[PDB]
Amino acid sequence: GIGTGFPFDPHYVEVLGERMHYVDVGPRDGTPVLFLHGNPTSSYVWRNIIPHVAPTHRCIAPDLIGMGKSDKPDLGYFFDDHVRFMDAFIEALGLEEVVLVIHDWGSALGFHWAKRNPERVKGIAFMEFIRPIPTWDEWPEFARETFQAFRTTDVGRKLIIDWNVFIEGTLPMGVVRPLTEVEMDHYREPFLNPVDREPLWRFPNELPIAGEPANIVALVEEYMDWLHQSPVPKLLFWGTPGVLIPPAEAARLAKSLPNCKAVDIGPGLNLLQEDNPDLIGSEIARWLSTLEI
Ligand SMILES: [Cl-]
């Protein structure tokens, strides 16, 4: 069934003094499609989606700094750090116009970049994306107590850094179907050493929940306001019950956002790519054929 391999030849580019790894496949010409993963994944999360798009479009899938095969500088790994590295990655590859395919923290990066570079975005496909979570009641009940505990320097660092709970617990709890041992080993590989787990803990502490942190909430509100008035073509994938995006929120956005098509992938939590990669990939390819790219 769902592929477990990661066949892609490694590419690296140096930005801000550090190497970022990326997948780069597909034809060399045309408008490239840039795939941005989130927490606690890597370009591995796109492995079964890219092959539907790569016949006809260049596919670029970087690993965020400190994640995947990318370098591990001694950083706080705040969202702001990821913004600087991704801004530099995009420019270092000489990308001009792009289509974005974005998920989780990759979607905050993608939307924030699109807001600041709107002339260069030809379309955005997005799923299980960062939006303001106004209260803890709007976080899924099944995941509420653990995410509240993650957002502390005592229990949260014990769980995420020392016990590897984000990889061993939260990740499988973000996929409806069972992950195999081989898939788990691909997700574990960047984080075998606890000293390398800072991004896994800082990311949930950056999530915009109940107004906190104020700076992230403001930045996310700004890109959501931009998205609501942007003519950019939009493709929204969602599942039931979801995690960041409940079905009601997907339906609300499908109506409120200009030029937006929405696609139900079936059962899904956070890593929709792991529950229905073939629908996501095939639908991205079909939608791309309708764009002026
Ligand atoms: Cl997170």
Author numbering: 3 to 295
Paper text:
Self-labeling protein tags such as HaloTag are powerful tools that can label fusion proteins with synthetic fluorophores for use in fluorescence microscopy. Here we introduce HaloTag variants with either increased or decreased brightness and fluorescence lifetime compared with HaloTag7 when labeled with rhodamines. To engineer the binding site, ten amino acids on helices 6–8 in close proximity to TMR were chosen for randomization by site-saturation mutagenesis. The changes in spectroscopic properties result from single or double point mutations in the direct vicinity of the bound fluorophore.
The brightest variant, the double mutant HaloTag9 (HaloTag7-Q165H-P174R, ΔI = 19.9 ± 0.5%), as well as the dimmer variants HaloTag10 (HaloTag7-Q165W, ΔI = −52.9 ± 1.2%) and HaloTag11 (HaloTag7-M175W, ΔI = −44.8 ± 0.8%) were chosen for characterization with a panel of 46 different fluorophores and analysis of their photophysical properties. HaloTag10 and HaloTag11 decreased the fluorescence intensity of almost all tested fluorophores compared with HaloTag7. The decreases were more pronounced for HaloTag10 than for HaloTag11 but in both cases caused by changes in quantum yield. For HaloTag10 and HaloTag11, the proximity of TMR to the introduced tryptophans suggests that photoinduced electron transfer (PET) quenching of the fluorophore is responsible for the decreased quantum yields. The decreased quantum yields and fluorescence lifetimes of HaloTag10 and HaloTag11 presumably result from PET quenching through the newly introduced tryptophans. Hence, HaloTag9 showed the longest and HaloTag10 the shortest fluorescence lifetime. HaloTag10 and HaloTag11 decreased the brightness of all fluorophores relative to HaloTag7, HaloTag10 having the biggest effect. Photostability measurements showed that the higher the fluorescence lifetime, the more photobleaching occurred, making HaloTag9 the least and HaloTag10 and HaloTag11 the most photostable tags.
